[PDB]
Amino acid sequence: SMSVKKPKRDDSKDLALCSMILTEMETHEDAWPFLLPVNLKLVPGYKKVIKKPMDFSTIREKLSSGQYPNLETFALDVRLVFDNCETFNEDDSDIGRAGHNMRKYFEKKWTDTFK
Fold this sequence. Notes:
Elements: H1 14-26, H2 46-49, H3 56-64, H4 71-88, H5 94-114
PDB class: dna binding protein
Assembly: monomeric
Entry title: PanDDA analysis group deposition -- Crystal Structure of BAZ2B after initial refinement with no ligand modelled (structure 146)
């Protein structure tokens, strides 16, 4: 509360560390469904169904331009990519499997770096 604070965590490396995680996600062989925004002119149903499209190139641009206020907002966009994937794609499909794989990959890096 006012004048009552937990000891100050060093957040000075967070930006660099999120960048590194994102590079690791970008270079994973199963990243291909997530690298660029879904083409809303060419994929029937996506625009109406997926209220908040997100992809790794969009996260990279937001990260590089100071649009994440803290590491929780960054994790929320990464998770949105996989939540969107699950919404639109059957589990038993190449893309559906890709999204589960990538979510697991991310969550381990996230825990290992920050927990």
